[PDB]
């Protein structure tokens, strides 16, 4: 009896931990989004800054 009452409450809190895992996943995806945008903007600006200089070399 106590084991059933333990396993169903454990299933309940496992669902709770799954929800907390989803919240943490949401924050980690936000982190991924901002990090990706930052260094994508950086490398595009860098390779496009390296191409304008190369164009400066081309006469």
């Amino acid at each position: 009896i106590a084991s059933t009452m333990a396993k169903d409450v454990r299933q309940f809190w496992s669902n709770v931990e799954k929800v907390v895992q989803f919240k943490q996943q949401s924050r980690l995806e936000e982190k991924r989004k901002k990090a990706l945008d930052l260094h994508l903007d950086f490398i595009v600006g860098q390779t496009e800054k390296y191409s304008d200089l190369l164009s400066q070399s081309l006469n």
């Binding site: 059933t4 009452m5 169903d8 309940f12």
Partner: peptide
């Protein structure tokens, strides 16, 4: 509340 609302508890 938690205990009584669980689907597996309905056998108890």
């Amino acid at each position: 509340s938690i205990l009584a609302s669980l689907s597996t508890f309905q056998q108890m």
